[PDB]
Amino acid sequence: ILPDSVDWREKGCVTEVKYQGSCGASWAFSAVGALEAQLKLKTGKLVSLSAQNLVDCSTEKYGNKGCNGGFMTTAFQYIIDNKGIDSDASYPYKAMDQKCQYDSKYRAATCSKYTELPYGREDVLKEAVANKGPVSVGVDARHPSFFLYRSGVYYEPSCTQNVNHGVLVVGYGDLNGKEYWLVKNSWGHNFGEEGYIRMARNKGNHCGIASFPSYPEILQ
Ligand SMILES: CS(=O)(=O)N1CCc2c(c(-c3ccc(Cl)c(C#Cc4ccc(Cl)c(CNCc5ccccc5)c4)c3)nn2CCCN2CCOCC2)C1
Numbered sequence: 001i002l003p004d005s006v007d008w009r010e011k012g013c014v015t016e017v018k019y020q021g022s023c024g025a026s027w028a029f030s031a032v033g034a035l036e037a038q039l040k041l042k043t044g045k046l047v048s049l050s051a052q053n054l055v056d057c058s059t060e061k062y063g064n065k066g067c068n069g070g071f072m073t074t075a076f077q078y079i080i081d082n083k084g085i086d087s088d089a090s091y092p093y094k095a096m097d098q099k100c101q102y103d104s105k106y107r108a109a110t111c112s113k114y115t116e117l118p119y120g121r122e123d124v125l126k127e128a129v130a131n132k133g134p135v136s137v138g139v140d141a142r143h144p145s146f147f148l149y150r151s152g153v154y155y156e157p158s159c160t161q162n163v164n165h166g167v168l169v170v171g172y173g174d175l176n177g178k179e180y181w182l183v184k185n186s187w188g189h190n191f192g193e194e195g196y197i198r199m200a201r202n203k204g205n206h207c208g209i210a211s212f213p214s215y216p217e218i219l220q
Helices: 026-043 051-057 072-082 122-131
Strands: 107-109 113-116 135-139 165-175 178-184 196-200 214-217
Touching: 026 051, 026 072, 026 107, 026 135, 026 165, 026 214, 051 072, 072 113, 072 214, 122 135, 122 165, 135 214, 165 196
Parallel strands: none
Antiparallel strands: 113 214, 135 165, 165 178, 178 196
Protein backbone atom coordinates (compact mmCIF):
# COMPACT_ATOMS: atom_id res chain seq x y z
CA ILE A 1 0.00 0.00 0.00
CA LEU A 2 2.95 2.40 0.60
CA PRO A 3 5.51 3.52 -2.00
CA ASP A 4 8.91 1.80 -1.98
CA SER A 5 10.70 5.18 -2.00
CA VAL A 6 9.81 8.77 -1.10
CA ASP A 7 11.87 11.97 -1.33
CA TRP A 8 10.13 15.18 -0.27
CA ARG A 9 12.82 17.35 -1.90
CA GLU A 10 11.27 16.23 -5.20
CA LYS A 11 8.00 18.02 -4.35
CA GLY A 12 9.71 21.30 -3.38
CA CYS A 13 8.92 20.69 0.30
CA VAL A 14 12.43 20.97 1.82
CA THR A 15 14.40 24.18 2.24
CA GLU A 16 18.19 24.47 1.94
CA VAL A 17 20.45 22.65 4.35
CA LYS A 18 21.39 24.82 7.34
CA TYR A 19 24.52 25.08 9.49
CA GLN A 20 24.15 24.98 13.28
CA GLY A 21 27.78 25.73 14.24
CA SER A 22 28.75 25.69 17.95
CA CYS A 23 25.09 26.06 19.01
CA GLY A 24 23.29 22.79 19.81
CA ALA A 25 20.15 23.87 17.98
CA SER A 26 19.66 20.60 16.03
CA TRP A 27 16.30 20.13 17.81
CA ALA A 28 15.24 23.55 16.48
CA PHE A 29 16.25 22.88 12.87
CA SER A 30 14.47 19.52 13.04
CA ALA A 31 11.30 21.27 14.19
CA VAL A 32 11.26 24.07 11.59
CA GLY A 33 12.16 21.67 8.76
CA ALA A 34 9.11 19.57 9.58
CA LEU A 35 6.89 22.66 9.66
CA GLU A 36 8.39 24.10 6.45
CA ALA A 37 7.04 21.16 4.42
CA GLN A 38 3.56 21.44 5.97
CA LEU A 39 3.56 25.13 5.00
CA LYS A 40 4.56 24.19 1.44
CA LEU A 41 1.78 21.62 1.15
CA LYS A 42 -0.80 24.16 2.37
CA THR A 43 0.32 27.48 0.85
CA GLY A 44 2.50 26.34 -2.08
CA LYS A 45 5.38 28.54 -0.85
CA LEU A 46 8.64 27.18 0.48
CA VAL A 47 10.06 29.51 3.16
CA SER A 48 12.73 28.72 5.74
CA LEU A 49 11.35 29.16 9.25
CA SER A 50 13.34 30.70 12.08
CA ALA A 51 15.27 28.16 14.18
CA GLN A 52 16.66 31.09 16.19
CA ASN A 53 13.07 32.03 17.11
CA LEU A 54 12.76 28.61 18.78
CA VAL A 55 16.15 28.90 20.50
CA ASP A 56 15.40 32.34 21.98
CA CYS A 57 11.66 31.89 22.75
CA SER A 58 10.86 28.19 23.36
CA THR A 59 12.92 28.14 26.53
CA GLU A 60 12.26 27.12 30.20
CA LYS A 61 8.43 26.98 29.90
CA TYR A 62 9.02 24.35 27.16
CA GLY A 63 11.88 22.58 28.98
CA ASN A 64 14.42 23.65 26.34
CA LYS A 65 17.84 25.25 26.87
CA GLY A 66 18.43 26.88 23.46
CA CYS A 67 22.02 26.07 22.41
CA ASN A 68 22.33 23.57 25.30
CA GLY A 69 19.51 21.42 23.81
CA GLY A 70 15.73 21.11 23.59
CA PHE A 71 12.83 19.16 22.09
CA MET A 72 10.91 19.28 18.82
CA THR A 73 7.61 18.37 20.56
CA THR A 74 7.84 21.31 22.94
CA ALA A 75 8.97 23.56 20.07
CA PHE A 76 5.80 22.71 18.12
CA GLN A 77 3.86 23.53 21.30
CA TYR A 78 5.57 26.95 21.50
CA ILE A 79 4.59 27.70 17.90
CA ILE A 80 1.01 26.72 18.83
CA ASP A 81 0.97 28.83 22.02
CA ASN A 82 2.78 31.77 20.35
CA LYS A 83 0.15 31.66 17.51
CA GLY A 84 2.99 31.86 14.97
CA ILE A 85 6.68 31.67 14.13
CA ASP A 86 8.80 34.12 12.13
CA SER A 87 10.57 33.59 8.84
CA ASP A 88 14.27 32.77 8.99
CA ALA A 89 14.80 35.81 6.76
CA SER A 90 13.33 38.10 9.46
CA TYR A 91 14.77 36.29 12.49
CA PRO A 92 18.08 34.93 11.14
CA TYR A 93 20.12 32.21 12.78
CA LYS A 94 22.99 33.64 14.84
CA ALA A 95 24.19 30.36 16.52
CA MET A 96 23.99 31.63 20.09
CA ASP A 97 21.43 32.21 22.84
CA GLN A 98 19.61 35.57 22.54
CA LYS A 99 16.61 37.37 24.03
CA CYS A 100 13.25 36.47 22.47
CA GLN A 101 12.69 38.81 19.53
CA TYR A 102 9.59 37.27 17.98
CA ASP A 103 7.50 39.80 16.06
CA SER A 104 4.02 38.74 14.85
CA LYS A 105 4.47 41.22 11.98
CA TYR A 106 6.95 38.80 10.35
CA ARG A 107 5.05 35.56 11.12
CA ALA A 108 5.68 33.13 8.26
CA ALA A 109 3.92 30.02 9.56
CA THR A 110 1.48 28.74 12.12
CA CYS A 111 0.94 25.33 13.78
CA SER A 112 -2.37 23.66 14.71
CA LYS A 113 -1.09 20.43 16.30
CA TYR A 114 1.64 17.80 16.34
CA THR A 115 1.63 14.01 16.59
CA GLU A 116 4.15 11.81 18.38
CA LEU A 117 4.76 8.34 16.95
CA PRO A 118 5.37 5.13 18.97
CA TYR A 119 8.91 4.42 20.11
CA GLY A 120 10.98 2.21 17.83
CA ARG A 121 8.20 1.59 15.25
CA GLU A 122 9.92 2.02 11.87
CA ASP A 123 6.82 0.71 10.04
CA VAL A 124 4.70 3.47 11.60
CA LEU A 125 7.43 6.03 10.79
CA LYS A 126 7.51 4.83 7.16
CA GLU A 127 3.80 5.60 6.87
CA ALA A 128 3.99 9.09 8.40
CA VAL A 129 6.82 10.10 6.04
CA ALA A 130 4.77 8.87 3.03
CA ASN A 131 1.29 10.02 4.12
CA LYS A 132 2.01 13.17 6.15
CA GLY A 133 5.44 14.61 5.26
CA PRO A 134 8.98 14.92 6.62
CA VAL A 135 9.09 13.82 10.28
CA SER A 136 11.20 15.36 13.08
CA VAL A 137 13.29 12.64 14.72
CA GLY A 138 16.28 12.26 17.03
CA VAL A 139 19.30 10.05 16.41
CA ASP A 140 22.35 8.82 18.27
CA ALA A 141 24.94 10.99 16.51
CA ARG A 142 27.56 10.42 19.25
CA HIS A 143 30.11 8.43 17.25
CA PRO A 144 33.05 9.48 15.03
CA SER A 145 31.59 7.59 12.05
CA PHE A 146 28.66 10.03 12.08
CA PHE A 147 30.93 13.09 11.79
CA LEU A 148 33.11 11.28 9.22
CA TYR A 149 30.13 10.11 7.08
CA ARG A 150 30.54 10.98 3.40
CA SER A 151 28.02 8.82 1.49
CA GLY A 152 26.20 5.49 1.29
CA VAL A 153 23.84 3.88 3.80
CA TYR A 154 25.19 4.68 7.25
CA TYR A 155 25.44 1.77 9.70
CA GLU A 156 27.21 1.97 13.08
CA PRO A 157 27.32 -1.19 15.26
CA SER A 158 27.96 0.88 18.45
CA CYS A 159 24.84 2.98 17.87
CA THR A 160 22.34 3.11 20.74
CA GLN A 161 18.60 3.81 20.63
CA ASN A 162 19.10 6.82 22.92
CA VAL A 163 18.85 9.99 20.89
CA ASN A 164 20.88 13.17 21.29
CA HIS A 165 20.79 15.04 17.93
CA GLY A 166 17.85 16.53 16.02
CA VAL A 167 17.39 15.71 12.35
CA LEU A 168 14.60 15.48 9.74
CA VAL A 169 13.48 12.39 7.83
CA VAL A 170 12.51 13.70 4.37
CA GLY A 171 12.09 10.28 2.76
CA TYR A 172 13.24 6.67 2.51
CA GLY A 173 14.45 4.20 -0.10
CA ASP A 174 16.78 1.37 -1.04
CA LEU A 175 20.38 1.64 -2.26
CA ASN A 176 21.29 -1.71 -3.81
CA GLY A 177 19.62 -3.95 -1.21
CA LYS A 178 20.35 -1.62 1.75
CA GLU A 179 17.16 0.05 2.98
CA TYR A 180 17.60 3.59 4.31
CA TRP A 181 15.98 6.72 5.72
CA LEU A 182 16.80 9.96 3.90
CA VAL A 183 17.85 12.33 6.69
CA LYS A 184 18.33 16.09 6.42
CA ASN A 185 20.95 17.26 8.93
CA SER A 186 22.00 20.78 10.04
CA TRP A 187 25.78 20.78 9.49
CA GLY A 188 25.90 22.52 6.10
CA HIS A 189 26.32 21.24 2.57
CA ASN A 190 29.82 19.79 3.07
CA PHE A 191 28.48 17.09 5.44
CA GLY A 192 27.75 13.69 3.88
CA GLU A 193 25.66 13.75 0.71
CA GLU A 194 25.12 17.47 0.11
CA GLY A 195 24.10 17.86 3.77
CA TYR A 196 22.08 14.62 3.93
CA ILE A 197 22.77 11.26 5.53
CA ARG A 198 21.09 8.05 4.44
CA MET A 199 20.74 5.92 7.54
CA ALA A 200 19.97 2.22 7.96
CA ARG A 201 16.25 1.35 7.88
CA ASN A 202 14.48 -1.66 9.42
CA LYS A 203 17.62 -2.58 11.43
CA GLY A 204 16.10 -2.56 14.93
CA ASN A 205 15.61 1.19 15.29
CA HIS A 206 19.22 1.75 14.30
CA CYS A 207 20.65 4.86 16.00
CA GLY A 208 17.22 5.42 17.58
CA ILE A 209 15.90 7.00 14.38
CA ALA A 210 12.30 5.96 15.25
CA SER A 211 12.69 6.43 19.04
CA PHE A 212 11.04 9.88 19.24
CA PRO A 213 9.44 10.87 15.91
CA SER A 214 6.97 13.74 15.57
CA TYR A 215 5.46 15.93 12.86
CA PRO A 216 3.30 19.07 13.00
CA GLU A 217 0.23 20.05 10.97
CA ILE A 218 -1.19 23.33 9.68
CA LEU A 219 -4.94 22.72 9.37
CA GLN A 220 -7.29 24.92 7.27
C1 LIG B 1 18.16 9.19 26.54
S1 LIG B 1 16.72 9.16 25.53
O1 LIG B 1 15.84 8.15 26.02
O2 LIG B 1 17.14 9.10 24.16
N1 LIG B 1 15.97 10.58 25.73
C2 LIG B 1 15.18 10.81 26.97
C3 LIG B 1 13.71 11.00 26.65
C4 LIG B 1 13.57 11.85 25.42
C5 LIG B 1 14.58 12.17 24.57
C6 LIG B 1 13.98 12.97 23.57
C7 LIG B 1 14.59 13.61 22.39
C8 LIG B 1 14.04 13.43 21.12
C9 LIG B 1 14.61 14.04 20.02
C10 LIG B 1 15.74 14.82 20.18
CL1 LIG B 1 16.45 15.57 18.83
C11 LIG B 1 16.30 15.02 21.44
C12 LIG B 1 17.47 15.82 21.61
C13 LIG B 1 18.42 16.51 21.83
C14 LIG B 1 19.52 17.39 22.06
C15 LIG B 1 19.82 18.37 21.13
C16 LIG B 1 20.89 19.22 21.35
C17 LIG B 1 21.65 19.08 22.50
CL2 LIG B 1 22.98 20.17 22.73
C18 LIG B 1 21.37 18.10 23.46
C19 LIG B 1 22.21 17.96 24.71
N2 LIG B 1 21.62 18.66 25.87
C20 LIG B 1 20.61 17.82 26.58
C21 LIG B 1 19.27 18.52 26.72
C22 LIG B 1 18.17 18.08 25.99
C23 LIG B 1 16.94 18.70 26.12
C24 LIG B 1 16.80 19.78 26.98
C25 LIG B 1 17.88 20.22 27.71
C26 LIG B 1 19.11 19.60 27.59
C27 LIG B 1 20.29 17.26 23.21
C28 LIG B 1 15.72 14.40 22.53
N3 LIG B 1 12.68 13.12 23.79
N4 LIG B 1 12.44 12.42 24.94
C29 LIG B 1 11.10 12.38 25.47
C30 LIG B 1 10.97 13.24 26.70
C31 LIG B 1 10.32 14.57 26.44
N5 LIG B 1 9.78 15.19 27.72
C32 LIG B 1 8.27 15.41 27.64
C33 LIG B 1 7.89 16.69 28.36
O3 LIG B 1 8.46 17.85 27.73
C34 LIG B 1 9.82 17.61 27.29
C35 LIG B 1 10.47 16.47 28.04
C36 LIG B 1 15.99 11.71 24.78
